[PDB]
């Protein structure tokens, strides 16, 4: 509800095909080992092949997936999770330490699911990657 507190941004340097795309989405978020056998979801794979669900929409499911929550959300601290969340979708470590902290309080109020939805909504994130393109390092 309330507008985000203004945080300073540190200067940064950064500032078969179908099957591969699914793997790429999985790879950035799960770092290879996590996909395993259990983490993979049949419905998400079907939607991409089906194309009913957009890639931007596809990632949200992975971000909000139960397997992801147990592995990262539960174990890690809220502040760490905000920093942790940034690498996979944004692809960039947060420039300002204070900014990361500001994000964490918001994450707690809306939950893990709430924070992920917010990242997609932000103008910088959509513009940087695009709906069609899988998230990549910046």
């Amino acid at each position: 509800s309330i507008p985000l507190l203004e945080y300073a941004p540190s200067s940064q340097n950064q500032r078969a095909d179908v099957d591969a795309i699914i793997w790429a989405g999985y790879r950035q978020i799960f770092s290879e080992h996590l996909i395993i056998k259990s983490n993979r979801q049949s419905f998400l794979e079907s939607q991409l092949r089906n194309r009913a669900i957009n890639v931007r929409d596809f990632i949200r499911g992975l971000g909000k997936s139960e397997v992801y929550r147990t592995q990262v959300a539960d174990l890690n601290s809220n502040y760490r999770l905000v920093d942790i969340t940034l690498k996979r979708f944004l692809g960039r470590a947060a420039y300002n330490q204070d900014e990361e902290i500001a994000w964490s309080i918001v994450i707690g109020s809306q939950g893990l699911h709430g924070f992920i939805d917010a990242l997609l909504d932000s103008d910088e994130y959509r513009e940087n990657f695009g709906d069609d393109i899988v998230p990549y390092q910046r």
């Binding site: 309330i2 507008p3 539960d74 174990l75 890690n76 601290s77 809220n78 502040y79 760490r80 330490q97 204070d98 902290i101 964490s104 309080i105 707690g108 109020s109």
Partner: protein
């Protein structure tokens, strides 16, 4: 996220033995006292919004420079900031009494709390004067018997107040 049921599994996995019979007699008392635990939880959440402002009638009246010009609770967004997360203490303390173990609370609510509270500039010690004022009002509601069958939930009252004392220790 751990429990009373799951934490007595997790150390029992680390030693790799079957669960003993006196651990199951321990958990049988946890089930037995479960009904009492549920009743206490519902009274806190039903009086959840009434606690926070009644703590804010004393959190700001006792240290009155905080809302006076200059204090960190002065302007209106800043004032709504220490009601947006005065309740998050109650949002996770009630999760701790539900789970029955403070491991849920430690991971999110207090893990990074004492670091932001010197990065922002807010008085960290001026939080734990009023979280104690929440505990004085929380155990007053949870113990009072109104339209309830007589029962003894004293053990919960002391370790309900232990969750507030853990909530005040890692901020101060």
């Amino acid at each position: 996220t751990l429990d009373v049921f799951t934490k007595v599994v997790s150390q029992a996995d680390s030693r790799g033995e079957f669960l003993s019979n006196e651990q199951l007699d321990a958990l049988a008392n946890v089930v037995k006292e479960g009904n009492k635990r549920l009743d206490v939880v519902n009274r806190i959440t039903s009086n959840a919004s009434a606690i926070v402002t009644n703590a804010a009638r004393a959190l700001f009246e006792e240290q009155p420079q905080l809302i006076a010009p200059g204090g960190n609770a002065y302007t209106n967004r800043r004032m709504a900031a220490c009601l947006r997360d005065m309740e998050i203490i109650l949002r996770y303390v009630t999760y701790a009494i539900l789970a029955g173990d403070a491991s849920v609370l430690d991971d999110r609510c207090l893990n990074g709390l004492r670091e932001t509270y010197q990065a922002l500039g807010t008085p960290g010690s001026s939080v734990a004067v009023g979280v104690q004022k929440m505990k004085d009002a929380a155990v007053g509601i949870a113990n009072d018997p109104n339209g309830i069958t007589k029962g003894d939930c004293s053990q919960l009252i002391s370790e309900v107040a232990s969750y507030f004392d853990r909530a005040a220790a890692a901020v101060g």
